[PDB]
Structures are given as structure tokens and as C-alpha cells.
Ligand binder design. Structure first.
Ligand SMILES: [Zn+2]
Ligand SMILES: [Zn+2]
Lengths: 1104, 42, 105, 67
RNA sequence: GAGAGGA
């Protein structure tokens, strides 16, 4: 057989996902962290000193995770599922090297644990690393589980990928609302992060800062930065354009209006208004130099006698500002994807561990100084006790910060909340889509329609259909299939490579000719100017393709400002693309054959320079072909496949290129909450809330994406024989008509598993909690409340429990602050009976009893349950009708679901009709058809198969009415559609209250459903009641049925009294009893607690 | 309005704090609410 | 477009620098400044080809095809020296232009 | 988990055929369509009951707590 | 308390 490139180039994605899986940002980031940043931070804080005893120091020679000394074997870790069940924390010990001196001046070594770092699932440290279907089975781990999430306190917490603006990059925004433009740079070092704005006020360029006083003129700072000629300023900010010099001439005379300046004088002026404080006495000029040396731009530290780099950086910022001034629309959009970076779990954990390690070292040094402060007999033996004392602190802080999601830091004074999310377990696609999720840095973005739009620059980088619809509709995004997040490759070698490539350095180009040719910017800072930019770009790209440099170093050309940018920092989003030479591609139809054979695992494709990683910015310089047949002899890249523009979730949809986009978005939203198979160990798992499908079925119309994410092995749905027809009237608006006698045979049958935990804590008074129970009434036998408890006080496995029906008879001492045991049993408070199927008893690390009881409840598709259609056609079960009262074809098939035909004409889900036809044709032909974005099984072939079997070419059979027994006067769209049952079931949503618990404060009904509370009739509802002009109903609803209080108001001083006693007049003669809402009484008392007196004045209701 | 008592400019300066009833500031599970702590500090 | 203009400019710079090298054969005080890749690959010759093509070599066979640095001017640049901290700073003269070389593929 | 005993739309008893179906794919390897038709599954409801089925219980039984 | 469906 001959390989066809146009239909076999798509096989690179399986290779890409095998070598670089879907969950690779978390895994690779954490592996890089544990392999590099541990030792980096160790060598950073490698020394602790003291004011006394100069011959005493601790040297951290080396650090390892899970590796005691040589060992030759990773230390034994608790398996992840054991940690999940026992509510422990999955972690590995950290062993460091020790170098502690002695009074005899002897250096000795040790290897001691310093803490326990949590281990990300399926990382280089986890035991699941390289486990194949037998080790995973023996460890109760699902082979198809994504990984990348931590197990802390027995909870699956995932560090979501955080998007942010690119650090150390110039972002200029023209606020025309006032005529103001700016040039701020959030330079971010490992220690400092500050914004150096360059605003434009009074047509005059300034430079604000968080460390200087107010609006320093730009000419002065340019003189202080070294460029004092006052004419090189005009040749660095305006070049030779006449229309720019007059714009910038206004602020060039502010270096002489106040007084003429020199470099020292300008430094003194900038340091005079420095708001930064000095902990040691420094001269104003000395501090001012610092204000230019490091304080102005943390990104660039000029630790030399020449500040030309920083001066030219400020000059380029001013040049950009002047360009914006002369003509707007030359600014750069902040929402542009190339201007954003993605920080994964590795970097965040690096920051947290660095903070914790520096705090630990400070505490250890303080303790060492305290112990050694004694003038005599200051022994050094057992100097490593306080380290093991404090080793609890580091691991406790790490686990707590990961679990709670509040990352408290002090070095940067940065506080971020909600970094870690509890891993979602509803379907398989839900748990996979929670991974590879991106959270916007914007808090709310109330009306700003910028960050919430779909930027075209994210084509292939982000899923252009998957986004929490609602209040985060545009803020939260998800990675696509073909997408690799970069990491910091190098910074120093690339400068030497550029200098070899033929760019004159920054200290050898005059300001006059600096704007006459392209200047190459390396990672945002000007390096030099090089003639022939095209030759330089081509040679650098060739060097990158041949493997000389890292594949993630992206070089591109900007012509609006003549520049050749080179980006090397990590966090850039990159995707693979096939390199095409003049006119033709580079796959050459024989590398595909080798790939299919088993060699060239997408890495020899990079080594041989057939494919390359393009980030968002490098795509500006490229011309990309969608298909090989469109390659004109000018394009420089080719798409591997256009259906990778959709994420893992969006791959569920069949024929997504035929639907309307909001339908695809709704499907991406509601496919996570579709009940179905979750994992292979879903029965060995005790989770808070699991929804399971009794008989899950593989979809008929598959997708090339769902084979790669293994959605055909753990599906969530069933192939319902849908008849698209208006039937029974109970399916008007999105409502469905479920078919009885199919629910009976098992269709939509589901299961709900809920865990209940109990901790038998040991109090400080040496008193435990006893689970003793099982009372007996007369003639033996257990009482009704204990009828399903068992002898040991833990509910028998397999029994049935109802309202009441204690299944954990826990008793607690009354003297916790042993005979007096107050009984505090765990009572199943449910509306329907559920069965006990698992009871696990164990202990945690601290040796305290822990009992987890799992209650299973088998649920039937009752009326009012929500079913989706994998196209955004969500609906409720309007009616359940018997089999005979249903249309039937010539063969006697009756539909399982009768979807209304009105869902289509206004939502344009033609993809659903094509799915029905393809599914019917495939099932008649006995094969699974493919509905994939931009392709899939063609309609003509499916219609040919449909007409070969004797069915109509359009899939419209002719049915017989089930209640009159005659033909339906219109042919009925009839065929299998993959319908998925969603978790929003009416059994969990029905809720009613007559009387019950009331709030302690305002004596009003509680709010939730776990507390029997009423429905809030808020401001909008009372306004609606006002509109009808219903006064007695308003009074009854908002006073009588909500909170009524009989108060005693004094007729003289309108203050409420108790028991007919005014307490102020002390007469009880003017007291009058009347009923007002308790909320009003509370308000009156709170006003009287302030210096406000709501004195109620009364008048007779009667007497005319 | 100076016609009635308490209609004086000197009644708007804190000389006596009305301590609200414990019903307004109940103790939860002890764990006193904010107002009790604030007036204890006062 | 860009490639053709770059090639024409490179040919113009080749002929211009050949003329400059021929013209500055007189040696009163004039210099010229070269930029070379570091690491010293190990000399060679600036071998001129037909139709005004210039290339250089080193002891290793390597044809660094890069000619013509910035034509920057209005910056008077002169070269001096240093002699063992004694009476020194002897003015060696000014430079006419600059050449930058680059290894090719 | 396992094959449904009865095909929801019609009622045919499709539970017994599953094993047989597997044999028709393992020994004397037919196509799925011909194997389904040879088992008497004429209506496409019974066909999609067997063809589009995941035998999850095979994977579940790898984690039995009484080995 | 704050993470996220949901209509
Ligand atoms: Zn009174
Ligand atoms: Zn059937």
C-alpha cells in the first residue's frame, strides 16, 4: 500500500501525545522543578552564619527527594490510593547534605531528612512513573487516570495553570479617553517585581515608579542613565523623522528649564525624590545611582561603569511612546496571546518552597544563636536537633498551602487565592478537562469585553470552543491538543550566537545610525543592530531546525518598528507545524511510512527538521497552509491537522464544524457533568460524590480525538434510538419524551455513591470516642433506629438505611474539657433509602480511628431528569410513556427518546442530523463512524449505505402511530443518537419547607437545602408583588410567614419594652403591644446601639 | 431641633456607649462575635 | 522582495568594500575595524570571486560569507594603544569603515 | 458493566449472544456487521446494543478485594 | 469561609 500524505500526515498527533501527553505541563514542570530548582535554591541559601563563633557554618552540599544517600532505590512511598483512602498526604522525604564544624575544626558529613514534599501523580518521583497495567492494578490505580494532581489530606488537588502578562516586556496602551499613553514594564526578578511606567502628561514624557516621588522628566533620567549629550537623545527617540522631533522637542527643554544638568546632577535630582528608605546611611547621590542601578528596572542590573543598555532600554520605551503619540493604532493589544505567559505548578511550587526554605533557615539560625549564646560549655554535639524539630514546620506549611489554595508569600508580598482546585470527578472527560485548564489573572472584568473575547491569535493554542459559559465565559480557557508549553532554555549562549551571526554589539553603534536598520531584541532588551535582517532570521531558523539550539527559542521579525525579536523564556505557548520548503512540504511521504512502522517517534522529526514549534509571535512572520493542496510557493508552514484547534472536551462533539458555535460551547460545558464510567477502580474508591452509569455504551459516531483521550473506553452515555418528532405535547420547550419499557430494561440507570467520614479523636484527657452501640428492645432484636447497625456499631455492608437508621453509632465523652458518654450517632437523613456497600476502618499517621462508610443509591430515570444530546440540546424528561403508545416502524422498533423537532431550526444543529444519519448507517453496516472536526465520514457514503439496506437515503423512516395504528402522514427522522444523562437529577433538587430551623440572629428560615429552609422572596419579587397592588399578601408573605414578633412599644418614648415594661419611663402605663417583623426589631436595637433613636410614634387605627 | 431634650450638639460625641443586647451579638460554637470583642477592647 | 533587495545590497556592499580595500592601500594613518566570531576556529584569505563576490577562510576550511557592517558615520572614531603604563596612548589613526563577518551554511 | 440482557428499544434478548459475538471476531474473524447479522440481530437497535458496548467489568475485575 | 457547575 502507498502512503498518502494528505490523509496520513495526521498520524503525527498520536506520536506527539505518546511522547508528550495531554497532562504534560504539570508533569514536565514538576519534574523540572524537582530536578533543577531544588538544587538551585539549595546553592542560593547554601550558608548560614553567625555574629559569634566564626568557625561554625552549615553547608548544604546536595539535596534529593525520596533518595536516602546512595540507597540505590527510591524510598518506599505510600501508594496514592492508600493515601486517598486514609486521608493522608502523598509525599516523599527530602534528604539534604550536612556540613557542620566543631571546636576542634573537624568537618563532618551527614544525610538527614528536612521535610516531606508532596509528589505530583505520575511524575519522576511517583511510583506510578512507568507502571504498566500490573503495577497499577496492584496499587489500585486506574491506568487511564490523567495524573498531574497532588493527594493532600486525602484530597485530589490540582494546581491550575495560571496565565499572566509577559514579564520583562514592554506593553504600551493608548488611553485616548484622556489623550494619555504609557510604557509600563512589570520587570520581574527572582527577588523584585515592579512596574516602571513611562506616562505622557502635558505632552511631556515622564517616568513614574512605586519607589520615586512623582513624574520625573524623561530627559533627566536619560542624562542620568549615561546619554547626556542632549542630541543623542533626539537620535535615540526620534531618529530622523521630522514629525517625531517636534513631538519630543517639548520635553527636551526640561533638562534646562529648571537648570542645566550633568550625569551626576541628574543622578542627584532623581535620588532626591526617591521614596525608598535606607537601612544604612547612604548619600543621596549614592542612593540615586542605586535608583538607576537596580530600583528603576529590576529586570536589568547594570553592575558596571557603563549604563548604555539601561539608557537605550529607556530610550526604546520613549520611542514606543512617541510612536503611539504621533499616531494611535500602533499600540499592542494586551489580550494578544503572544503577550501572555503560562506558569504551571512547577514554578509556583518553586516559589513556595523557596519562601519556606528561607523561613526555615532563618528560624534554624536564630535557634543556633540562642543555644550557642552561652559563654561557656557551648556544646556542638547534637546540633541537628532543632532541624528535625522544625522539619515539621516546612512540610506542614507546604501541605497547608497546597490544600487551602491560599499562597501566602512575604518576599514579594504576593497573595494569591484559589490556586489549587479539588479535582472534579463526574465523568472521565471532566477529570481530564479540569487538567489542562487555564485561569485568567483578571478578577472579574465586569464590562471589559477585551479579555473575554476569542482572539484569532489563539488558533491552535487554546480550545476555541471550551469555556465555562456564564460569569467566567471568556476568562477560563483550556489548552488544545497540539500545544507544548515552553521552559527557560538559555539566555547567555544566545547572545554569543547572535554576535557570531553578525550583529554589532550595543556599545559599538552610534545613536545616529541606530534607527537606520533593524535592531535585534533578545528577550526584550536591545542587543545591537544588524544589517540584512532577513538573512539573520533565516540563518537563525536554520540553526534552530538543525538542532544547534533549543527547539523553543522563537525568532521573528517586526517591521512596524524595525526589530528582530528573539524570545527564549518559558511559558510561551508553542504548537508543532510541518516545515514546507519552496512549493512542497518536507514529510516527503516516506517519513510517514517510517512513523507508521514504529520508528521516528516525532523526535527524529524534530532532529531531521521536518516539523518545528511555532509560538504565537513567530506565526506573525509565517504563512500557514491549512491543507497540502493549498500550498502556494510562498507559504513556510503547514498544518498537521486542523481539528486540533479543539481541546479534549470539545473532541466529544460529532461533526462540530456543522453546528452553531454556542451549541458547541454548551456541549463543552455540559459534557463534564455527564454521568458515566469514571475509572477502572471506581468501585475500590470512596469519594465524596460519585455518579456512575450502569450500562455505559461507546458512542456510535466517534471522533479521532476521543480515541486519543480514551473516551471510548470509559464513556458516559448510551445510544438512544431517537425519533425526531412532535409527540404527546409533553416535549414543547427542550423537554424530552422518554420511553418506558426501555427504562425498565435499563436505560439511564445510574448510581450515586456518597462517603461519610468519622474521626474518633483522642482528647488531651486520655479519653477516646467509643463507637459502641446496637441497643436491643424486648424479646431481643435491635430497635428500629438500630435495625441496620450491626453488633460493632458500624452499619452492615449490603443492608438498607432510611430516614433515621443510625449506621455509625459514635459516642463522645461529656468531659472532653469515661462513663458519661453523650451519644452522637451519624444518622442517614435522606428522602429515599440507600444501601451501605463499603465500610473502611483505619487510622491516620497520628493513630486516631477513621471510619469511612460509602452509601450507594440506585437511581431510575424519573420524570424531570436532565438529558443532554452531545450538541448542546440539553433537556428534561417531560413524560415517560409506555412502549405500545409509541410510534413503530415496519420492523417494530420503538424510539427510546422522542426529541422535539423544534430544537433544530433555531439552533442550526445540522451536525446532530449528520450524526444521526452516520450512526444509523454505521450500525446497519456494523461499524463505528467518525464525526471529527473538518472531515469525518462523508454524508454521501452514509446515505449509500442507508439505501443499500432498504432504508431511505435521508434516514427518514415511515412510522405507524402507536395509539391509532395508522401511518404518520410525514416521514420521521429515525436513528441512533448518543444521549448522555447529566447529574442534575430532580431527586436532589426537590425541596420544600413548612416550618423548621430559623436563623439564631434574625429568627428567619435558614438558606440552604441541607438545612430545612425557605425560599428567599427578595427585592425583585416584592417589587413584583407591589406591581399587582397586593397589600395583604405582601404583609402575610414578608411578616406573617417569615418572622412575626409581638413587641411592646412605649406610647411616650417610642422605644420597645419587655413584658409590658418601658425600662425608660418605668411606668408600664403607655406600653402598647403590636406585631412587627423581628428583622425590624433587630434593626431598631442595632440603631439604638449606635447613637440613633428610632422613636416609634403610634396613632389609633380606628376612630375615623 | 432644640425643642426636645437630646437636641443638643453635645449628644453627638461619645460619652456613653450603649452596649447592645446579647441577642444582637450572640455567641456561636465559646466563640464570641466581633461586637463583643470590640466592646471588650473598648 | 526582501531577499532580492538583500542580495542587491550585498552585491553593492561587496563591490564597495573591494573598492575601499583597493583605495586604502595607502597607509598614512587609516585603519578598518573587523568583527569576527569568537572562539578562534583553529590564517586564511579574503578570496574575491567572479562578479564581485567576497569570502574569507581560516586554517580550517570554512567560508564565512558575511561582508559589510553598518555604514554608520558622523561618529569620529580613532584607534589608540597602551604601552606598559609608561608614556603611551599613541594615536594610531582613524578608521574608514567597519566589516562584520559571519559563518554561513 | 456487562451486556444488557434485553435490547432497550425492541426487547430482544441480546444478553446471551455477546460471548458468541466475541468468538465470531476472534476465531473465524468476520467483520462486525456480518458477525452481528449471523447472530440474528436484524433490527439495528439490537445491533447497536452489542456493537457499541464496552465490557467494563473485565477491567473492574482486575481490582477484586478478595484475591 | 471561598471553588465550581446551574438556570
Ligand atoms: Zn417610655
Ligand atoms: Zn432490539
Amino acid at each position: 500500500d502507498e502512503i498518502n500524505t494528505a490523509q496520513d500526515k495526521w498520524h503525527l498527533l498520536p506520536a506527539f501525545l505518546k511522547v508528550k501527553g495531554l497532562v504534560k505541563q504539570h508533569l514536565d514542570s514538576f519534574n523540572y522543578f524537582v530536578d533543577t530548582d531544588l538544587k538551585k535554591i539549595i546553592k542560593a541559601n547554601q550558608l548560614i552564619l553567625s555574629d559569634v563563633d566564626p568557625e561554625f557554618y552549615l553547608k548544604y552540599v546536595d539535596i534529593r527527594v525520596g533518595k536516602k544517600s546512595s540507597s540505590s532505590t527510591k524510598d518506599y512511598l505510600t501508594p496514592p490510593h492508600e493515601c486517598r483512602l486514609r486521608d493522608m498526604t502523598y509525599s516523599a522525604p527530602i534528604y539534604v547534605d550536612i556540613e557542620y564544624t566543631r571546636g576542634r575544626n573537624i568537618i563532618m558529613h551527614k544525610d538527614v531528612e528536612i521535610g516531606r514534599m508532596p509528589i505530583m501523580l505520575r511524575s519522576n518521583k511517583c511510583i506510578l512513573y512507568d507502571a504498566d497495567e500490573s503495577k497499577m492494578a496492584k496499587l489500585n490505580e486506574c491506568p487511564l487516570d490523567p495524573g498531574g494532581y497532588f493527594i493532600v489530606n486525602g484530597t485530589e488537588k490540582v494546581i491550575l495553570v495560571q496565565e499572566q502578562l509577559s514579564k520583562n516586556r514592554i506593553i504600551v496602551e493608548a488611553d485616548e479617553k484622556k489623550g494619555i499613553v504609557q510604557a509600563s514594564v512589570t520587570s520581574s526578578t527572582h527577588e523584585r517585581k515592579s512596574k516602571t511606567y513611562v506616562i505622557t502628561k502635558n505632552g511631556k514624557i515622564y517616568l513614574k515608579h512605586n519607589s520615586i516621588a512623582e513624574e520625573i522628566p524623561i530627559a533627566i533620567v536619560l542624562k542620568a542613565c549615561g546619554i547626556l549629550s542632549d542630541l543623542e537623545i533626539m537620535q535615540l527617540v526620534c531618529g530622523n523623522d521630522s514629525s517625531y522631533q517636534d513631538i519630543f522637542a517639548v520635553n527636551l527643554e526640561e533638562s534646562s528649564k529648571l537648570d542645566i544638568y550633568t550625569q551626576q546632577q541628574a543622578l542627584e535630582y532623581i535620588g532626591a525624590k526617591v521614596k525608598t528608605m535606607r537601612r544604612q546611611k547612604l548619600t543621596i547621590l549614592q542612593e540615586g545611582i542605586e535608583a538607576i542601578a537596580t530600583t528603576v528596572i529590576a529586570h536589568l542590573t547594570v553592575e558596571a561603569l557603563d549604563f548604555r543598555e539601561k539608557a537605550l532600554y529607556i530610550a526604546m520605551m520613549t520611542r514606543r511612546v512617541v510612536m503611539a503619540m504621533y499616531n494611535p493604532k500602533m499600540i499592542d493589544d494586551r489580550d494578544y496571546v503572544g503577550n501572555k505567559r503560562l506558569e504551571l505548578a512547577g514554578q509556583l511550587i518553586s516559589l513556595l518552597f523557596e519562601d519556606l526554605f528561607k523561613k526555615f533557615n532563618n528560624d534554624f539560625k536564630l535557634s543556633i544563636d540562642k543555644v550557642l549564646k552561652k559563654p561557656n560549655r557551648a556544646m556542638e554535639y547534637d546540633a541537628l536537633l532543632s532541624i528535625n524539630v522544625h522539619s515539621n514546620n516546612i512540610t506542614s506549611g507546604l501541605n497547608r498551602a497546597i490544600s487551602t489554595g491560599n499562597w501566602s508569600l512575604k518576599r514579594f508580598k504576593m497573595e494569591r487565592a484559589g490556586v489549587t482546585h479539588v479535582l472534579s470527578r463526574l465523568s472521565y472527560i471532566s477529570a481530564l478537562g479540569m487538567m489542562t485548564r487555564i485561569s485568567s489573572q483578571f478578577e472579574k472584568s465586569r464590562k471589559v469585553s477585551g479579555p473575554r473575547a476569542l482572539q484569532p491569535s489563539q488558533f491552535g493554542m487554546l480550545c476555541t470552543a471550551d469555556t465555562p459559559e456564564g460569569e467566567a465565559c471568556g476568562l477560563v480557557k483550556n489548552l488544545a491538543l497540539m500545544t507544548h508549553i515552553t521552559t527557560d532554555d538559555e539566555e547567555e549562549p544566545i547572545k554569543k550566537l547572535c554576535y557570531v551571526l553578525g550583529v554589532e554589539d550595543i556599545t559599538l553603534i552610534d545613536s545616529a545610525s541606530l534607527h537606520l536598520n533593524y535592531g535585534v531584541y533578545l528577550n526584550g532588551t536591545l542587543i545591537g543592530s544588524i544589517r540584512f535582517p532577513t538573512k539573520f532570521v533565516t540563518q537563525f531558523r536554520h540553526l534552530r531546525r538543525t538542532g544547534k539550539v533549543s527547539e523553543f527559542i522563537s525568532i521573528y521579525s517586526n517591521s512596524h518598528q524595525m526589530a528582530v525579536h528573539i524570545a527564549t523564556d518559558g511559558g510561551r505557548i508553542c504548537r508543532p507545524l510541518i516545515i514546507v520548503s519552496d512549493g512542497q512540504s518536507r514529510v516527503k511521504d516516506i517519513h510517514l511510512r517510517k512513523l507508521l512502522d514504529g520508528e521516528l517517534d516525532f523526535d527524529d522529526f524534530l532532529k531531521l527538521g521536518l516539523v518545528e514549534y511555532l509560538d504565537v509571535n513567530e506565526e506573525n512572520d509565517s504563512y500557514i497552509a491549512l491543507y497540502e493542496k493549498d500550498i502556494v510557493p510562498s507559504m513556510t508552514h503547514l498544518e498537521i491537522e486542523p481539528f486540533t484547534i479543539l481541546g479534549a472536551v470539545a473532541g466529544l462533539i460529532p461533526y462540530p464544524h456543522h453546528n452553531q458555535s454556542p451549541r458547541n460551547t454548551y456541549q463543552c460545558a455540559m459534557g463534564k457533568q455527564a454521568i458515566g464510567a469514571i475509572a477502572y477502580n471506581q468501585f475500590k474508591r470512596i469519594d465524596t460524590l460519585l455518579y456512575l452509569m450502569t450500562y455505559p455504551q461507546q458512542p456510535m459516531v466517534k471522533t479521532k480525538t476521543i480515541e486519543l483521550i480514551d473516551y471510548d473506553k470509559l464513556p458516559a452515555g448510551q445510544n438512544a434510538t431517537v425519533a425526531v418528532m412532535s409527540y404527546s405535547g409533553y416535549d414543547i420547550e427542550d423537554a424530552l419524551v422518554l420511553n418506558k419499557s426501555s427504562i425498565d430494561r435499563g436505560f439511564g440507570r445510574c448510581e450515586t455513591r456518597r462517603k461519610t467520614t468519622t474521626v474518633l479523636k483522642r482528647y488531651a484527657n486520655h479519653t477516646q470516642d467509643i463507637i459502641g452501640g446496637m441497643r436491643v428492645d424486648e424479646n431481643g432484636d435491635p430497635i428500629w433506629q438500630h435495625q441496620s447497625l450491626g453488633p460493632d456499631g458500624l452499619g452492615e455492608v449490603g443492608m438498607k438505611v432510611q430516614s433515621g437508621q443510625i449506621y455509625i453509632n459514635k459516642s463522645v465523652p461529656t468531659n472532653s474539657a469515661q462513663t458519661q458518654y453523650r451519644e452522637a450517632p451519624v444518622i442517614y437523613r435522606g428522602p429515599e433509602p440507600s444501601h451501605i456497600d463499603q465500610v473502611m476502618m483505619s487510622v491516620s499517621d497520628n493513630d486516631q480511628a477513621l471510619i469511612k462508610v460509602l452509601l450507594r443509591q440506585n437511581r431510575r430515570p424519573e420524570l424531570g431528569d436532565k438529558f443532554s444530546s452531545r450538541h448542546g440540546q440539553k433537556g428534561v424528561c417531560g413524560i415517560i410513556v409506555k412502549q405500545e403508545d409509541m410510534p413503530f416502524n415496519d420492523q417494530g422498533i420503538v424510539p427510546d427518546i422522542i426529541m422535539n423537532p423544534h430544537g433544530f431550526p433555531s439552533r442550526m444543529t445540522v451536525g446532530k442530523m449528520i450524526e444521526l444519519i452516520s450512526g444509523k448507517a454505521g450500525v446497519l453496516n456494523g461499524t463505528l463512524e467518525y464525526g471529527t472536526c473538518f472531515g469525518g465520514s462523508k454524508l454521501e457514503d452514509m446515505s449509500k449505505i442507508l439505501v443499500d439496506q432498504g432504508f431511505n437515503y435521508s434516514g427518514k423512516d415511515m412510522l405507524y402511530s402507536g395509539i391509532t395504528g395508522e401511518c404518520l402522514q410525514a416521514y420521521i427522522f429515525f436513528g441512533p443518537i448518543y444521549y448522555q444523562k447529566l447529574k442534575h437529577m430532580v431527586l436532589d433538587k426537590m425541596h420544600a419547607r413548612a416550618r423548621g430551623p430559623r436563623a439564631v440572629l434574625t429568627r428567619q428560615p435558614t438558606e440552604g437545602r441541607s438545612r430545612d429552609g425557605g425560599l428567599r422572596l427578595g427585592e425583585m419579587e416584592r417589587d413584583c408583588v407591589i406591581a399587582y397592588g397586593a397589600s395583604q399578601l405582601l404583609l402575610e408573605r414578608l411578616m406573617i410567614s417569615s418572622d412575626a414578633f409581638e413587641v411592646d412599644v412605649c406610647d411616650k418614648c417610642g422605644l420597645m419594652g419587655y413584658s409590658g415594661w418601658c425600662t425608660t419611663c418605668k411606668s408600664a402605663e403607655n406600653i402598647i403591644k403590636m406585631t412587627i417583623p423581628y428583622a425590624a426589631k433587630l434593626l431598631f436595637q442595632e440603631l439604638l446601639s449606635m447613637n440613633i433613636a428610632p422613636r416609634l410614634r403610634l396613632e389609633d387605627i380606628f376612630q375615623q | 431641633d432644640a425643642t426636645v431634650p437630646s437636641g443638643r450638639p453635645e449628644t453627638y460625641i461619645w460619652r456613653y456607649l450603649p452596649a447592645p443586647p446579647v441577642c444582637i451579638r450572640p455567641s456561636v460554637m465559646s466563640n464570641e462575635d466581633d461586637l463583643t470583642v470590640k466592646l471588650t477592647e473598648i | 522582495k526582501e531577499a532580492a533587495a538583500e542580495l542587491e545590497l550585498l552585491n553593492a556592499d561587496h563591490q564597495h568594500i573591494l573598492r575601499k580595500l583597493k583605495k586604502m592601500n595607502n597607509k598614512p594613518e587609516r585603519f578598518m575595524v573587523f568583527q569576527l566570531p569568537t572562539r578562534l576556529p583553529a590564517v586564511g584569505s579574503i578570496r574575491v570571486h567572479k562578479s564581485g563576490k567576497l569570502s574569507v577562510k581560516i586554517g580550517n576550511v570554512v567560508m564565512d560569507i558575511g561582508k559589510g557592517a553598518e555604514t554608520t558615520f558622523l561618529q569620529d572614531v580613532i584607534a589608540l594603544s597602551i604601552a606598559d603604563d609608561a608614556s603611551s596612548a599613541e594615536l594610531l589613526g582613524r578608521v574608514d569603515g567597519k566589516i562584520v563577518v559571519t559563518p554561513q551554511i | 458493566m456487562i451486556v444488557p440482557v434485553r435490547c432497550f428499544s425492541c426487547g430482544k434478548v441480546v444478553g446471551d449472544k455477546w460471548e458468541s459475538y466475541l468468538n465470531l471476531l476472534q476465531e473465524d474473524e468476520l467483520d462486525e456487521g456480518t458477525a452481528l447479522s449471523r447472530l440474528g440481530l436484524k433490527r439495528y437497535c439490537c445491533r447497536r446494543m452489542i456493537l457499541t458496548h464496552v465490557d467494563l467489568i473485565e477491567k473492574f475485575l482486575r481490582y477484586n478485594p478478595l484475591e
